[PDB]
Design a protein around this ligand. Structure first.
Ligand SMILES: [Cl-]
Ligand SMILES: [Cl-]
Ligand SMILES: [Cl-]
Ligand SMILES: [Cl-]
Ligand SMILES: [Cl-]
Ligand code: NA
Lengths: 310, 310, 310, 310, 310
């Protein structure tokens, strides 16, 4: 029974985040729990405060026509309880539900761990026999409690794109809204647990530049190479497989390269010094001691600029 | 109460993909979210545009006879919300639901990670008292939304096989339709994370051909063997166990052989060179320095041709 | 309202496998999706083709008395949707449902990975006021679609044990039927990924018989020992804890022993050859070179006979 | 509408275990599938065999008053299908359901892997308008199926404590019954997969007492220590964190000590023999060769006695 | 349709914890099973004990108006069974349900494993047309059974904050109540499994100060470095990623630093002693032997004070 109309029906939406949680990097999903609030004019429900009863009447959902509002990107239909439906004298219906869903929104891992993400909640409504278009009432979209926390992320803002995207799908009009939760990863913990140990085992690796023993050098460089393989695995398992190159994906690969030519060096110095050519072996190692750290820091400046400063 | 009929009821089908997600290589399952669209003529519902009310009349599912449409490959029956049901005057019914399922479709791992897959969604309907045959009207089959993304995969196309498979099952005829989602894996991230590190440690393995010390060579070759074991484990656990040989399964196995024969060699060189026979020790080691890369690259050309070019 | 009867009621059962999947070795459970088909005579529903309507009458489940058929081994009650109910003029009811459950059946790992299993689906019905006995209609019993696949398994047959097992449970007579799905693991993939690498690292361990270097030998034997521990873990974690000895559990253990006495040997040779007693050390090692492969191949002949050929 | 009562209603309870499964040591939960049977006198339901119908008639659950029987230690309320309800002419009601739940009962890990547990299923009933008390009818509590199995566990018995604990909770009387499933871990597989390898790498560790080589000793003792850490990890991840000390927790911890002072020995001997003090170095090592196995074996006697023999 | 009122409707609340379980550190959620008890005056229900039946009358929830009481920090709506509804003649309703939910409360990992937590359960009710204020009756709040246990945690208390926080949300008043479960972690098992082994491998690492062999020293220090990397991973994977520094995260990091300068030292000793400057190379190593344990103990006092002593 949609309200009989001379024009497009505006349903006013707002979302108030109550709890936010389980951001899944591999899955690129997050779970949300909130108030969805809808409001629309059905004048067939209009009344007189004095002549009709009291100020607002409440109906349960089976009474009224309610628009079917679905979230566009969600694994399953949201789980919702209807909190209230209240009709105002002029025919204004105010609906409030409390819902929970896990949303599917893509993530950009290019600056990971140093990445910020903008999560989307898309609302659509589909027209039949009268047009529906969604729009946002900003006073009920303000959207967060001060206790809302998303673990391991700082929550920057929750807002909505006010103009909907109206389009045709299978010979009917659909109206879509984009709600945006922007967040920034807390990169802190990555430093003691990942970045710094990586660095230590690399530096320890090239400690072999002040040594002449082939077996101690092989032992060093391959030990440290092992731990770097473990860190690459540790990191890679908690990330999805991207078509593109992440920032620490880049530095981790770069590191593989430094390990390779460090092994080339130790091998070459050893060969030279069983060739009775210790002058040239020694001059290579003397050089590496400067070359390796410097080219590392240069490559890292270049890399960092490439990912962040461009 | 089926529509009483003069011959088979054609149910016209379509699927419009909204979301795709959770492609599970081990499970060989993927999760889909879509519009299922059915239309059929039940003339008992035919009516009067002028005499009765409005142009098109709408029903809820409890009123009308609906055909029972099942998916063949699914863990469970779909979770569906009925979006709308609309009947036209001549008795044409248009049914629209939004469903979610995890589909069970087999995958071919032979060219993995460079593999391409065709996922299937099967619709069957079972007849009673008159035959039902499902068929596809392409305008509601057009499938993909343009933002459908399957993480770590490129979605190349979504189409439907127009001719249904009509056959006999338990003394009634069933009609089955095959919808096909073709996709290709994104192999990129495999290169920095698996292939290149694998190659690097194999090369580091061969650095022992320019050394004469048994212990540094053993240390080298068994260390790199260790990391290669780790890679074959990492790779193998994220894959199902196939009756056939996968491409990177082949290259990984081959790598095992190069490790073994490398060990045989270092062992042999050391033995010869404690046998007071450095002429043949040195000549073996020198030979291997050319032999191993050459045979590796030849084996890889042979293999790549074997898997892809065949 | 059970059919009032002059005799114990035969419910004819049958199962048609549509989907098979998720065989979980650790849990010893597998998931199935199929047709359950029932037929029984309720004469109260009997009617006349000529005077009564025409040939077959259809009911909803709430119309008819339906027998409660439960699966004996299932974690939870199955999820079933009723496909059809058809009554024939004489009072024969033909019921058809589509269900999905995870069946819980024990597995025999003695010959793992080279092993066959017989999976069971048990149906009971519980009698009241009239006896129920279940039995199978063999032609509504053809079990499979030609598209059923169980990952990592070859499906040999799906049949039903024709004579039911009738017994008393909680002071009433219950009737049980045994449906049997026999399967054999595809051992292929175990060979390149587990078995052969295990062997290689064992042989690599034995190169220490051609070396007199204590440290290169200790390095060898403990390195490969490490890899064998890793393989033991890889295999055993994907298995349940059996009260008995699995086949590859045995060979993995046997391998542990060969590693131990290899360490003993390496130890004894080094000790003998630092006491200036190299003659007997050398002849020990010489012997080992023959003994270890000989006793390995023998122990394995013994074991393989013991598990499979006995 | 409870049965009109001149006294407390005794509901007679019984449970028949059908399937048992998923004992989770970490969670301390197990999953059960069984018959719950209740019986009580509701005289309001009394009737005349001759005047009324037949001997006994059947109800669906909302016709009759049924007691609300809940499991006390359980994650969520059970999933139950009501199998039958039968009222006897005198007003005796016999209720039967088949339920499935995961039960939460604590486990005692002190003698693990050699530990036995008693799993509990607790029933409460809560009074209104007349007191309800649960009590146990042993003839329908009788056993499990004889095919009931709990993986990697031997099932000792299933019995019930006949006297209930009737007590006050939130100003009404609740009656609680304790059903006890006694079980014993099957420790077998722990011996080939955990105990024996642990020992082997420990002995291999002590092989360094017959060596004077500093580096072969460090390589030995440190390699084996690595594998022991791997075992400690493997074991501890499948167990919950106890405020107390387990048996293999003790054994593993002890082993750490033996590795440590083994390292101390190796270090002290090398130091002594670069002090040109080989007399006492050799005498230390010579002693260790006896002391380590002896103090180990006696410490194990002490430990075993301390945990098990009390 | 709430009870018609001249003032705010007070719903009196209480929670009695029955089972507690699944505290999840990374998710920062825990699962609870309890009694929710609500009581309020709805006078429309008032009655005469004598004319109608008995003293107190019972309803099913669908008859009466019940307040919608929601939990604030919870993932999905709780699963609830209504245990009892009892109306007193004056119109006082006493409602009792048994619920289970996973609550989402933040955790403070700063002193981990030595950390204490206060978990929160928040109840809101939302006003319409009459104010609702939740408040708590202490007698049905007693909250624990003497058997409530949370694995790996000791439970200090369960209480509720008596004053509700009444505030305005979306132009209706909401009343919120704070129940507090205080728990403290059981750190015991962390000592044998994590802390002490970490310490052993660090000490074993420092044995390299009593040795002059470069290769035995790098073998020592990098082996132990490996095992410590493994401990850091073992710990980090069972913890969430905090914006701050945890206590054992701090000591783990500090340990990394000690490994780094141990490597620097070992490297420097070797370099000086191939530079023919053994006097103070040796005197450096002599110093390290005291310095490292002393600075370790001072850094640990400093750190421990810093975390716990404030
Ligand atoms: Cl050297
Ligand atoms: Cl050598
Ligand atoms: Cl040697
Ligand atoms: Cl030495
Ligand atoms: Cl040295
Ligand atoms: Na070494």
């Amino acid at each position: 029974p949609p309200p009989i109309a001379d024009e497009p029906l505006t349903v006013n939406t707002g979302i108030y985040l109550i709890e936010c949680y389980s951001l899944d990097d591999k899955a690129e999903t997050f779970k949300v729990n909130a108030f969805l609030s809808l409001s629309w004019k059905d004048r067939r429900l209009a009344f007189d405060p004095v002549r009709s009863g009291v100020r607002v009447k409440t109906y349960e959902p089976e009474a009224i026509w309610i628009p079917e509002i679905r979230f566009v990107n969600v694994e399953n239909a949201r789980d919702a309880d209807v909190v209230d439906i209240s009709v105002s004298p002029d025919g204004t219906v105010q609906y409030l539900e409390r819902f929970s869903a896990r949303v599917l929104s893509p993530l950009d891992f290019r600056r990971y761990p140093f990445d910020s993400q903008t999560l989307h909640i898309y609302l659509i409504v589909r027209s039949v026999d009268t047009r529906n278009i969604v729009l946002a009432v900003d006073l009920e979209k303000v959207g967060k409690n001060d206790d809302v926390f998303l673990t391991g992320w700082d929550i920057e803002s929750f807002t909505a794109v006010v103009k909907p995207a109206n389009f045709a799908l299978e010979d009917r009009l659909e109206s879509k809204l984009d709600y945006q939760l922007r967040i920034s990863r807390q990169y802190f913990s990555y430093i003691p647990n990942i970045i710094l140990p990586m660095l230590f085992i690399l530096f320890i690796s090239w400690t072999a530049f002040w040594s002449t023993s082939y077996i101690a050098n092989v032992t060093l460089v391959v030990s440290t190479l092992a731990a770097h393989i473990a860190f690459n695995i540790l990191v890679e398992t908690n990330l999805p497989k991207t078509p593109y190159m992440t920032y620490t994906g880049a530095i981790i690969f770069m590191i593989y390269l430094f390990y390779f030519v460090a092994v080339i060096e130790v091998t070459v110095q050893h060969y030279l010094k069983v060739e009775s050519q210790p002058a040239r072996a020694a001059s290579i190692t003397r050089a590496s001691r400067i070359a390796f750290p410097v080219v590392f820091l240069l490559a890292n400046i270049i890399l960092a600029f490439l990912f962040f400063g461009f």
